[PDB]
Amino acid sequence: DDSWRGVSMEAIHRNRQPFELENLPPVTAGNLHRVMYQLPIRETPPRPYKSPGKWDSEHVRLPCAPESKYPRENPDGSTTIDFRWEMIERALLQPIKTCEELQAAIISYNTTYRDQWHFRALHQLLDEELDESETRVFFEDLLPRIIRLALRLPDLIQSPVPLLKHHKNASLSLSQQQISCLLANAFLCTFPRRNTLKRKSEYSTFPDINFNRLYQSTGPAVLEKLKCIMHYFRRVCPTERDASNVPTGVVTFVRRSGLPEHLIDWSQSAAPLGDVPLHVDAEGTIEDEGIGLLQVDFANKYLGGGVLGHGCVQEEIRFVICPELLVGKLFTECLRPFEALVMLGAERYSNYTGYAGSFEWSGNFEDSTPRDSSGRRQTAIVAIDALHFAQSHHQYREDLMERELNKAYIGFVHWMVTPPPGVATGNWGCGAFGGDSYLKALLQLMVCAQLGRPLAYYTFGNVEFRDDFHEMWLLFRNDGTTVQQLWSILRSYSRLIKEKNKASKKKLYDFIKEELK
Ligand SMILES: [Cl-]
Ligand SMILES: [Cl-]
């Protein structure tokens, strides 16, 4: 009569309370860890760290930077070159009473995009979705708050914000407050040099950050993501009265970049697959039931995927109910094959129903997840990007099974002295992305086996698959099957499929009871 099979949740936690095992070391400022606030944290919210600003190829181009210049065409037809931040202030402190004036204000410092940008999702939310009185509240209450917060960027960010590039193991930690400010800037499309669509541009290996592409999109899932974002700002912006609602803590972003040294040779892993404490659940979610665990983000190589766009599946949804993740887009270069991004601290602000086109904001969430010693909520998320397959069969290539093993490997490494909590994951890169649920569950088990991590796997309503995966773990447990041995069998399946879901699991049966004599 239970939703789950395999080992129990208490067991995934080693019969120790959730949150006793940590997923990241404490924040310390170092050569490889930049921290945007003063350590140790005395006052809350954390006090900003002060150092000389940077306008260069190694750091975020901040909208408030004195180096940021902009041409303005004037009434009289002439050019004035001015400081773009000063133009931004002037635009955003004019009164703004309608959606057309908001767009015109934003365009006034983005004039290149005058006839390319149209904020149709914002027009749809404010002119068609909301009643006259909720729209008046957006322009009299919320938008003024977002502007005031955006304009405090030079007060809240007083040190350079580094980019987390390719092939560099590095961490960045910011206050939730600092992130709210950066995001208010993105909402108002203020980030310089991050708008061009030209193919071989400065930041073309970085995700989008200005919210314009969200505003350009259509359909109800998009309006619902806007509602999540509106709500985030209502939660985290100071009210006219007081700033007591402003979030108190910290978020840490860690780029994991594996060296060739770190690559596992999978045909040498002597790790027994059945020794993995496996908990497979057909109800529940990673974000709810996976507390204390390393929760997986079924990521795009560009962090956040199409969250600022039409995207509304597992990654995008997590980035709008926990919007502080969005700031990763500002500074995180796209993930190479042996890289991952760990995100610890992101507060949840919203509840939701549905998935893809049915996705809806369904109310306020008051996150009471306890904070670590560093002031981070103990919500640890790893972004690992699966491959997409137009052709299902391609994924059975040995090279692309190994690519996925190694992607999940770099995501799931621990590299701490204390022992690792379990991973909370599910159907990674499956459904419409082409991944085989059955294969991807095994790859994830192989990785967890090898690293000595429990695995809580969520099948999101699929009892059938819960059982086939549980059953295969039992078969490995009392056959004492090993990683290198399942790898061997999996390589066999590679060469069989090159001649031509439920079939991957039938052939292991076969290549496994042939051993049983
Ligand atoms: Cl001006
Ligand atoms: Cl610009």
456 and 473 in contact (C-beta within 8 Å)? no
| DSSP state letter for 243 | S
Is residue 505 in some structural domain? Answer: yes
Is residue 450 in some structural domain? Answer: yes
The CATH number assigned to the domain holding 336 equals 3.40.220.10
- Cα 99 to averaged position of ligand 1 atoms, centre (Å): 20
| DSSP state letter for 432 | G
Is residue 48 in some structural domain? Answer: no
First and final CA of the chain: distance in angstroms? 36
HSE, CB side, 13 Å, CA atoms: give it for residue 470: 18
Interhelix angle for 84-93 vs 143-150, to 10°? Answer: 160
CA distance 275 to 441: 16
Is residue 104 in some structural domain? Answer: no
195 and 113 in contact (C-beta within 8 Å)? yes
Q: Which amino acid is it at 45?
A: P
**Which among 176, 209, 201 is positioned nearest to 62, based on CA atoms?**
209
Is residue 243 in some structural domain? Answer: yes
Q: What is the DSSP string of 263-304?
A: ---GGG---BGGGS-EEEESS--HHHHTTTSEEEEEE-SSTT
Ramachandran class of 179: left when φ > 0, alpha when ψ lies in -120 to 50, beta otherwise: alpha
Four-point Cα dihedral 185, 189, 191, 196, nearest 10:
170
152 contact partners, CB below 8 Å, separation of at least 6: 181
- Cα 228 to averaged position of ligand 2 atoms, centre (Å): 28
Return the beta strands (E) in 266-414 as ranges.
278-281, 294-299, 339-344, 350-353, 360-364, 380-385
Ligand nearest to the CA of 81: 1
- Cα 70 to averaged position of ligand 2 atoms, centre (Å): 7
Q: Which amino acid is it at 15?
A: N
Could you tell me the resolution of this structure in angstroms? 2.5
Q: Which amino acid is it at 143?
A: L
Ligand nearest to the CA of 65: 2
Four-point Cα dihedral 368, 373, 375, 380, nearest 10:
-70
- Cα 72 to averaged position of ligand 1 atoms, centre (Å): 7
Q: Which domain holds residue 283?
A: 4-34+163-260+273-513
459 contact partners, CB below 8 Å, separation of at least 6: 280, 281, 282, 426, 427, 437, 465, 466, 469
List, in sequence order, the alpha helices (H) in 165-299.
176-187, 212-216, 220-236, 286-289
236 and 251 in contact (C-beta within 8 Å)? no
Three-state secondary structure call for residue 330: helix
- Cα 374 to averaged position of ligand 1 atoms, centre (Å): 42
- Cα 404 to averaged position of ligand 2 atoms, centre (Å): 38
Is residue 194 in some structural domain? Answer: yes
The phi, psi pair for 443, rounded to 5°, reads -55, -40
Ligand nearest to the CA of 67: 2
Is residue 25 in some structural domain? Answer: yes
- Characterize the bridge pairing of strands 380-385 and 170-175: unpaired
Ramachandran class of 257: left when φ > 0, alpha when ψ lies in -120 to 50, beta otherwise: beta
Instruction: Go through the chain and tell me how many residues it has.
Output: 517
Ramachandran class of 107: left when φ > 0, alpha when ψ lies in -120 to 50, beta otherwise: alpha
Three-state secondary structure call for residue 22: coil
**Which among 381, 383, 365 is positioned nearest to 290, based on CA atoms?**
381
**Which among 27, 16, 22 is positioned nearest to 417, based on CA atoms?**
22
- Cα 110 to averaged position of ligand 2 atoms, centre (Å): 7
Q: Please, which experimental method was used?
A: X-ray
- Cα 246 to averaged position of ligand 2 atoms, centre (Å): 30
Ligand nearest to the CA of 92: 1
Ligand nearest to the CA of 202: 2
- Cα 109 to averaged position of ligand 2 atoms, centre (Å): 8
Q: Which helix (H) or strand (E) holds 202?
A: none
- Cα 205 to averaged position of ligand 2 atoms, centre (Å): 17
410 and 340 in contact (C-beta within 8 Å)? yes
Residues pairing with 251 in the sheet: 174
Four-point Cα dihedral 246, 175, 254, 435, nearest 10:
20
| DSSP state letter for 392 | G
45 contact partners, CB below 8 Å, separation of at least 6: 175, 176, 177, 246, 247, 248, 249
Is residue 303 in some structural domain? Answer: yes
Catalytic positions are 297, 315-316
**Which among 364, 130, 343, 327 is positioned nearest to 235, based on CA atoms?**
364
CA distance 406 to 400: 10
- Cα 150 to averaged position of ligand 1 atoms, centre (Å): 18
Q: How many helices (H) and strands (E) does the chain have?
A: 18, 14
Residues with CB under 5 A from ligand 2 (ion): 192
Ligand nearest to the CA of 82: 1
The total domain count for the chain is 1
